[PDB]
Amino acid sequence: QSVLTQPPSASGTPGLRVTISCSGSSSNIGSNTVNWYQHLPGTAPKLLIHSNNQRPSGVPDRFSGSKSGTSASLAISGLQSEDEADYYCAAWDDSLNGWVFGGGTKLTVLGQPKAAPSVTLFPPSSEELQANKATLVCLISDFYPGAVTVAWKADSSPVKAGVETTTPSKQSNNKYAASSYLSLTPEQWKSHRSYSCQVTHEGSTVEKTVAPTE
């Protein structure tokens, strides 16, 4: 666990304000300055605020920092979609004689329109079946918000065994993609009339069905 406490999530409206808090103790925030970093996994963290409230050159005046007692806060005004990222506070800790980071806060900017997932389901290839395996591939794309649940069916019966699903990943167009794989034996594949992949997003379901080729 992180020695500085931050809320795991925060959300704000485009053009408005959001505040991200950081709570510490007398040995860290109570005695030392606080720095803030913005991070998008896949790129290095970027310094936003140093020495409690100083902006490095290139950081817009929309970002401000403050410190009071054993707590610090980052305020973001005129929220832009580009501000969606993880925000971390950090301070030197005198008792540990080292740096401490907060657990980070994931900031969501509430502007974005909802988008239903596009679903493609592929049956096993004849080549894979000849190799004594059978993989059904369910590809899910262009959905927003970035969360889906996947349900597989053998004819009409639910199937939980042999299912591997990815976490959603942000696409170039800021919508999300995910995929789900169902591993079967050639016997199980050939024994049913069909298999289906059911994707549920914001309560609404999109289904695709595939069947063996005789």
Binding site: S2, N32, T33, N35, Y37, H39, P41, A44, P45, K46, L47, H50, S51, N52, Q54, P56, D86, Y88, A90, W92, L96, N97, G98, W99, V100, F101, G102, G103, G104, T120, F122, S125, E127, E128, A131, T135, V137, L139, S141, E164, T165, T166, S169, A177, S179, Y181, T213
Partner: protein, 221 residues
């Protein structure tokens, strides 16, 4: 001044890894180099630091003599060595330079180095064609692709028709299976009218296993 880190590492549990960080267009001067990691779905975690000119080091208590940080002033390169690797050590490792006038803030960061710790062994993928199927009948569109199955470690690259086909290509992030192996799929959205005449070949490269595979994707028959 930029910080350039060494490439991705793939290690077995119990082994040791050494990551480098080279100052480019500058030196370490009297600044410190700090090491910070981020495990998947976790926050930033400080590991330790060094002030190269004074040879003083500081380490995070949670790493009890597992981390060693060193530097050589001659080539302006700092190193982090993490021993007795465990699955929990899989993470991106960053180096960063501190700035004393900015209350020791980390103003310059390296690009990061991915370290994967796994009991899996290198394996080239099995590539299977995904025969064209209807996508939109009204739009006259079809989806076809390739399944890149059971490989280790990441990454793989997929191209179509030796890079001549880019429009409508979507290569999905890989799934990491309970087996310890990865699988991904690459799908192309094409016109259904072209299927009887246009050739579709997926080219799969897996440099860690020195594997290069081509797979023709033809209409179902």
């Amino acid at each position: 001044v930029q910080l350039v880190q060494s490439g991705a590492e793939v290690k077995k549990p119990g082994s040791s890894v050494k990551v480098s960080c080279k100052a480019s267009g500058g030196t370490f001067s009297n600044y410190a180099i700090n090491w910070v990691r981020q495990a998947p779905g976790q926050g930033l975690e400080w590991m330790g630091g060094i002030i190269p000119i004074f040879a003083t080091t500081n380490y995070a208590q949670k790493f009890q003599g597992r981390v060693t940080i060193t530097a050589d002033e001659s080539t302006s390169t700092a190193y982090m060595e993490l021993s007795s690797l465990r699955s929990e050590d899989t993470a991106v490792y960053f180096c960063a330079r501190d700035k004393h006038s900015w209350s020791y803030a980390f103003d310059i960061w390296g690009q990061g180095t991915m370290v994967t710790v796994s009991s899996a062994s290198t394996k080239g993928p099995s590539v299977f064609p995904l025969a064209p199927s209807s996508k939109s009948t009204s739009g006259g569109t079809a989806a076809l692709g390739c399944l890149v199955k059971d490989y280790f470690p990441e990454p793989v690259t997929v191209s179509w028709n030796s890079g001549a086909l880019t429009s409508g290509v979507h290569t999905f992030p890989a799934v990491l299976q309970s087996s310890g192996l990865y699988s991904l799929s690459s799908v192309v959205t094409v016109p259904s009218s072209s299927l009887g005449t246009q050739t579709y070949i997926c080219n799969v490269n897996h440099k860690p296993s020195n594997t290069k595979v081509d797979k023709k994707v033809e209409p179902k028959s």
